[model samples]
Each structure stands twice: as structure tokens, then as C-alpha cells.
Target: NQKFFTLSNGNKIPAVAVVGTGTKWYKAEETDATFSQELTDIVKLSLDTVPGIVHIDAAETYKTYPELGAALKETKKPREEIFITDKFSSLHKISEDPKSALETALNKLGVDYVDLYLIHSPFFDKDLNIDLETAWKQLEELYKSGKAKNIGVSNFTVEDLKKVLAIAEIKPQVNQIEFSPFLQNQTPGIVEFSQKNDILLEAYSPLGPLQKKPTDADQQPFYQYLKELSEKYNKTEAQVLLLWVYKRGILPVTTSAKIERIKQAQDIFSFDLTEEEVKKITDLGLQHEPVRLYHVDFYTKYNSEAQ
Candidate 1:
């Protein structure tokens, strides 16, 4: 299996990454020790069990850097072997200092630089009155300063991307978004636009259709088809779902606290899905009402404008 995708900047990124922490796994009320220990265990498990599992996705909001830093120290892995991606949170926009936000993240992670850094969302444009162009320029400066080897945005719609692209000296190398067959159907043009612009799409919740309970009876077909493929390929449903995203050339970021599940995720590379099979799942997915699990307002606005 090809373990990496070449970014537009000519940097190699892992084809898949184990999320450092996300909203579902990290709780706010948990004691710092408990949260750190739990995430530390998961990170160590991935590094020890999965070969070449060096890419880790984190965000300032997730508060995962300290745990990630600890895990790397315990595992004795060289810093250069691990590829880290961190995000600039909207909360940091209050200070209007992206460089400081990134420095804090680097300090927490005990790293000098991140492999990739992204503006977490475009909502800050209205919520904080900081324009997208301004935010992107800050990211460009980070790239220039070598603190962030690559810079990009996340949760950005096609329109949002256009605003940044119009004035960007360095185009966004990536746009990490909630990409599932459902989201691809929900927000139609982002995939095409990003692809045309040489922006790599990193899928967060690539398994959204599996994770969220189906609200409509029509949604069953997609699940049923996934089951059929799983049975035929002797792979789990999650593996089949992730493979669809992989086959589409989008990098999938998925996570599981269970070591077995993390190992199972890497098994997707063992089997190949035909192009026809990939299209069939996409067709079944499009038949159901599009469901998005995050950034509801952003996508809702984009969906309304798209129609």
C-alpha cells in the first residue's frame, strides 16, 4: 500500500492518520491526568502496533498535544519520524495572533515545528470579525517562518476557499473537512474545486455514515451495500468505508481507543476495491439525505447558497 500522499508543496503525508484526540473521545470534565493517560495509551498503542503509523492529527481545541508529547517521549521515536498536524482554533482568533497560537501548540507538543498547520474554520470570519484573507495570510507567514512546513484551512466551503485563493500568495496545500460519501453529496463542489486547485482534501470522520445513526429508511441501502462489500472482501464495514475514501484519493483521519480496531483500520490496504465497486457505494450514498455531523451552520449556509 502507498503509505503517503505528496502534498502540493512536495512534502509527503501519510495516507491515513490516527487522530490524537477529537470531541467524541476527549471530554472537558475529565481530570487532566485521566485524559492524558487515556490519550497517551491510544497514541502509544498506534505507534507500537501499527507499522509506519507516524502521522497524528491534533487540534488546539482538542488539547491533545501534551499527551502526544508524552507518548512520543516514552516510545523513543525520533521527532522526524512522526508527522504532526495541528490547527489554529477560533478561540485564538480573539488575540489575533496566529503565530502565538502555533507557538503554544508547539510548546505543548514539545516540538519545534508541525508538519502541517491549518486554520480550524472559516466561521471566525464572521464570529470574530477576522477576515479569511487575514487568517490565511497569517498561515502563510507561519509557512514562511518554517514553524509550519505546510499551511491550509479546514471546514471551508468552496466559497470560503475562493476568498482565500483570490489573495493567497501561497495556496492552501490542504483543506481538512468532514468528508464522507454523505458530505460529498451534501456540499457538492468542494471536492472538485480543491482537486482542481491542487489542494489535498483530508477527511475527518470519513466514516460519518457508519458513526451516525440513520434517520431515514432510505439510508439503509448504503449500509447494506457496505455490508455486502465487507462480506465479499472479508473486510470489516469500517475498512470498506475508509477504503472508499482512500480510493477517491482523499486522506482519511480515523481513530479508535481500541488497539484491535486501530490494527483493523490498517488492514484496509491489504485488499483492493474495484472502481465500479467504489462508484456503487457512492451512488447508494447519494440516494440518502445528506447528513453532516459538524459545523452545521457553515454547511447549512453553503448548502442553501449552492442551491
Candidate 2:
């Protein structure tokens, strides 16, 4: 299997990335030396043990830049060999200063520039009083300046994407979202629109079903189906879910503190799922109400407007 996917801009990104740090893995108050060291060790473990896993997904909001920086320094991997992804947070949007925000991120990560950069969310308009078009313009500037090699947004609906596309000189290269079988239809047309525009979709929380409980009765069948697939394929449920995402042409980003699980994630490439099996999973998933774990208000508004 190809380990990398070429972006619209022609940059090769790894098909899968390890979440270096995230909200669910580590708490904010636990940002002490011990926590940082533990996470730094995990980051280094992923880089060392996972084959073809040079990509690291990070964010300013996650407060993990410094820990990631430490891991990079300790690992002594050549800078060009590692792909580091970071994000512009809502606070930066509120302050209206992407330049300094990225600068800060770079300083903390100890990198000249990031492989990919993104606006963390589209709620800047409603929650922060910042317009999407204007916010994207700053990202455009960062892209042009070569600080952010590729620029995009996360948690953006089709409407939000269209708003930016209307004014954008350089269109978004990616849209990272919480994608899974259970939430595939959360925002209608998002996948198709992104594909139509040549914007790559990256899936965060692709294993959302494992993390959150089933919201409806139909989810039980979906879980059972996953177990059956796992038994047939001799793979874990997480690998099955990730393969489904990869089969749909989306990059999947997942994380684990345990080195074994991190190594296990890459084994999805060892087997393949049939087209019929993939479709069946999607059909079963659609039987349940869409389960969105993050950005609830924004998606709520977008779905209501679509209705």
C-alpha cells in the first residue's frame, strides 16, 4: 500500500498520521514535566516503531507543541523526513493574528514551518465575531509566505467551505473532520463537495464509536457487524474502522499512548475490505442518528439551515 497521498498542491502526505497530542489523551492542567515527558516518549515511540508513520498531527489548542518539539529533538530524525501538522486556534482568530500565532507554534515546535496548517474550526464567525473569508485570507497569506506549506480548515460545513472558496485565491487543500461510519452523513454533501473541489479530507476521531457510547439502537448492529468483520479479517475493530475510512479515500489520524496499539494501527494495510462490505457498513451506520462528538453547535446550525 502507498504510504502517502498527494495533496492538491502536489505535496505528498502520509496516508495515516499519529495524533501527537489531543484533548482526549491529556488534560490541560497536567501539563507538568511528567506529563510532557510521558507524551514526548509516546511521540518518539510512534516515530521509531511505526513504519511509514512520519506524519504527526498536532494543534496549538492541544498545548502539545513543546512536547512534540522535545520528541523531535530527542529522536534526532532529519527535519525533512518528518511531517508535522499544526492548527490555528480560535484564540488566534479572535486576536486576528495568524502571523504571530504560527510564529509561536513554530517557535514551540522548533521548526521553520509546518507540513500542513489549518484553521481549527469555522465557529469564528458565530463565537469569535470573525468572518470565515477574512480568517481564510490570513491562512492564504501564511501559505504564500511558505510558513504553512498547505492550508485548510477543520469542522467546516459545505456552506463554510463555499464562503471561503468564493474569495480564496488559493483554495483549501484539506478539510479535517470527525468522520466515521456512524457520522458519515452528519453534514450532507461535505465529502462530495470536498472531492469535487479537489480538497483532501482528513478524518479525525475515525474510531469515534469506540470512544463514545452508541446513541441509538441501530448502533448495536453496527458494532456486531464490526466484530464479525474483525473475526473474518483477523484484525482489530479499530483497524477495520480505519480501513473503511482509507477505502473511502480519506486520511485517518489516530493516537495511542501504548506502543503496541500504535504499531497495530499500521497493520490495516495488510488486508483489504470488499466494496460490498464497505457499503453495508455505511448502510447500517446511516440507520442510526449521526453521532457528532465535537463542534455540536456549528453542525446543528448547518444541519438546520440545510433542512
Candidate 3:
């Protein structure tokens, strides 16, 4: 079995995790009945095979809310045994009423309440760039109303997190981010800030086996190190990546439509990485320019300016 990361709200999250398959990663053929059913099968198989997979990260932006709802209905797992995490977006942050937006998500999820909900990003509006004061207030209301069991943030820096804590009656329970050995060092004060405030940092992309822009010279050393670790532990390169993130005390949430990779995400608890090896990985990551893979431009444009 995998370990658990207890949240500030007392939700015991699985140390390893999976996400709802977003439409962005889906093929046109995947939308067909056979492939669609296969995706649902993958979800069930993950639950059945992976003892540590309790959280399923989803977002309204991903457009897979209904599919996730369908999977939950199909699976034998009870609602209490599963923790469903969803996000509200800046795209519709102020357009539709925030509470109503949450209501729509609930309807799609076929649940009266979600285990956790987050403001997807600190940015308020795409066009207007409005402040998040009103939104944070609405999120607080959702928590009070019991529609969202816990409320937090994603892609937030230290300043952004402090700003919310500065105004809110409720403290955030978690902060989901792009975290791994590669990207962890990039954010200067966020990790410390979150730790000080009792906000658990959930790493969305925990595996860093490939460099975003790699030449033979740039990439060889890191791969060699990972390969060495893999061979020593008798695990796949991916398993080493998961163990690396786990050793740092960050919670990892990953996903795969393939059943074999889904099972691979759980093989980490069988081994340990010593302090020296952990430092080696961390030091190597810091030496390079960080390779952030997902949603780069949106963050660059919005996070460039101070929160």
C-alpha cells in the first residue's frame, strides 16, 4: 500500500494519485464508443490495481467532469473511499456566478459535494484582469455551504497564497502546483511559504525523466543518473521518478490511459532513495534551466506581474 498525506482539513490523501483524462490529451478516435469505454475501464483498473490511488484531479477546464461522473457511477468504490478534486476557472471566474459554476460542476460529477475544490489559478479574468477578492469570498461561501468539503488554490506563488490567507476566514488546505526535482527549485519561496502555513503542496507533474529541449550533451548526464537508480532499485525509470518526488515529502498526482503505466505509478513504496541520492537528483535539477511542460504561456503572461 502507498502512504498518505493528511491535509489541513484532515482529508487523508493517497501519496500517489491519478487525474481525470482531459479532452486535450484525448484522440478523436478516443471519443468513439469503444475508446470512450476503454478510458472508463482505465479508471476502474487504476482503482482496483493501485492501492494508493484515492485522489482524482479534475477541472472544469478539462471538460471531463461528466466522464468522471460516469466512471464513479460505474465503479464499485464508494464515494467516501474516493476523493474527487476539481477546479473553478478564471475563464469563467466572473462570467457565470461562482456558486452557480460550482453547482454545475456538482451536477456533472453527480455528487452533492466535492472532497476538494480549488481556484485553478490566481489570475482573475483573461480580458479584464480583475482582482480575486470577490472570487475568494465566493470560494469561502462554498466551503461554508458544505458544497466544497475543502477549498484551496493551484499554481499559486508565496505572495498569492499569502494574499488569500490575508483575507480569508478559512485557511487553504493545499496548493497544487507543477512540482518535481526539475521545477521545485524554480519557485523561490513558495515551498517554504506553504509549509509554514500548513498547506500541503500537491505535485501535478512529478516525473521529470525527459528534458523539454535536450541535446545529447544536455540530457545524457540526467538520464544516466536515472538509469543508474533504476538499475540499482530494479524498477523502471518512471518508478524512480515517483520515488524521487515522494522522498522530498511532496504529494504526487499522475495519470495514464494505459493500464501498465497506471500499475507502474504504485511500485515506488517498495524501495528507498538515500539522502545522498536524493541530493544528487535535487542538485542536478537545480543546475539546469527548469523544463516546465504544461500550460506555460498562461502562467508566464499572468504570473509575470506580481500578485
Candidate 4:
């Protein structure tokens, strides 16, 4: 997995999930030997993609390291070639044992250390004496102890980020959130904070839930405009958006299972979205508050907000 780019903490991340385990989120069976076999297949598919950003989700605990390492050996891709990423999810992010929770994440992945780890969200209300400062303290300790190389937060607002920055001894290197044609975090202050602090911004949900059963107004004016240009330029709507994003020098966490889509995502490097087209698409978004995709009010949930 070639790095999407390096982190402020000085480690590389693959731009996409070539070795992702998203299907496990659906129906991951854990019946003895079958667990290992299933995991092996996921890892294999990840490596086979153009970018091998393999992920080790919470299911990491259900599998073993030797099995994971053996699969890497089979792929002939060095462990260093892929990112074995994991997270301390919302429920556990604010739990009493954030320390032990991190230890568990480490143990489950079967690695003495993980390349990157994240606060899945600061939304869990476990009714404990949950101090956000203490949660961060444990993560810093994990970094110092060589259990995690990069530390970041997800779905955080400027105020939430300030809460971390206020007590943070080691600055957060990344912030993962949704930023596509629909939801642009164009706040000047937020952009300045990220640039000033050297915090890398990672955009999740980049394509903005275009697939799956779309709504009646699923027709995006910007995307529609681009569709005409896409045909004229001999490119796909998705390709144009992705190229525009890459041109702006942003990182997007895109999800796709088909090989063709994966190939199309990489097609951006070969072309460019004209500045006028980029601005036209930029102006086409419907930014009314009600249509906004993510809000802290609903951050407590573990799944996608679309559900």
C-alpha cells in the first residue's frame, strides 16, 4: 500500500482502503477455523487492489497476528507495505478503561504496535467519570509506549478539537470528517487551524452517499453539470469529482468494492478538472442546514448517519 501521504506524526497512510474489511461490518462469523479463512480472503482482496490500505477493524480481536502476518507473507507484500489501522470506537472511546481498551486493540491486531489508531468518536455516554483529557492522556501514553505511531480524532468540531488541543501534549495529526461536494468544511477558522497546527485533514464519506437507494432529488446539479462535461471530456462523474478533490490536495476515504470503480478512482492522476468546472460544481451544492449529513447531535450512533 503506497501512502495516501505522510502524517504530521511522520508515518505514511495509503490514500484508500485496498485491504479494507468493511464487509465484516455486515456478517462476520467467528466459528473457529472459518474466522481465519474469512480474514485471509479479505486481506487477499485488499492487497490485490491498486492501493493496499488494509484495515483491521474491531474484529481484530477475533483474529490472530500470526494468521494476519502469514497472509501478508503469502501476498508477498511486506507488513510495512500496508497500514494495519484500528480505532477505539465511540463506546470504548469514553469508557473507564480507555487504557485497557487501547491495549486490547493492540493485542487483537497481534502487533506490538499499530501504524495508526483513532478515537472513533467522542460520542459515547457510558455514564462513567469520563474525562476527555484523560482519554487523550492514555492515547499519548500509547504513542510514547510504541503501541501506536499516529493519533487522530474523528467527527470532531472546532470546539471539540480545541478541547483536545487545550490539554494535548502531543498534537493530533489528523481529523477525519465528511467533505464532499455537498458538505464542505469551508469555515475559514477551521481551515486556518488545520494549516497552522499542521493537522492533516482526511475526508470520509467523500462521494456523499450517491449509491445505495438514493432520494428523489438524488440528481446533483453539480454532478449533472459535470456529467455533461464528463461525457465531453470522456470521463465519469465520479472521476471528475475525485480529480477535483485530489487537485485541491485533499485526502478522501472512498469506499468501493468493484474493481472497475477502484480503477476509475485512480484515473484522476491522468486528467484535471478545469478551474471553472471546479467552481461551478462548488457553487451547485445545497447547503441548507436540514440537508447537512453529519451533526454532533447524532454522533452518538455507531453506524452511518444515512441509516
Worst 10 residues of 1 by lDDT: 298-307
| lDDT (Cα, tens digit) per residue for candidate 2, span 1-307 | 5367788989888887765586445455435653567778888877766666477889877777778888887886677878888887763342345667798888877789999998888765345555677778989999999999999988788888988889999989999988887678447788888988899999988888777755652348888898899999999989899888888899988877777777777767889999998998888767755667777765764543221
Candidate 4 C-alpha lDDT tens digits along 1-307: 1336667777777554323444444433434544456656555555655544443333232334434554566775556656666566554332354566667655544457777766766665576465667777787898888787888776666777889999999998877666666655632245446656777766665666354214533374554576686787787777777665554456666556555666566545556677887777666643322123554355333223211
Model 3, CA-based lDDT: 0.72
For each candidate, give its TM-score against the true structure: 0.90, 0.89, 0.86, 0.75
The C-alpha RMSD of each candidate to the native structure, in angstroms, is 2.8, 3.0, 3.8, 5.0
Candidates' C-alpha lDDT:
0.78, 0.78, 0.72, 0.59
lDDT, candidate 4, residue 298? Answer: 54
Q: Residue-wise lDDT of candidate 3 within 229-276, one digit each (tens)?
A: 889989887778877888877877777676777677766687889999
Model 4: lDDT to the true structure = 0.59
Question: Which candidate tops TM-score?
Answer: 1
* lDDT assessment of candidate 2: 0.78
> Which segments of model 1 are wrong by more than 4 Å?
23-34, 91-95, 125-130, 185-188, 215-219, 301-307
Candidate 2 stretches greater than 4 Å from native: 23-35, 91-96, 125-130, 213-219, 301-307
Candidate 1: which pairs clash? none
Those runs of model 4 whose alpha carbons end farther than 4 Å from true positions after fitting are: 1-4, 17-19, 24-40, 49-74, 92-98, 127-129, 186-192, 212-220, 232-235, 286-307
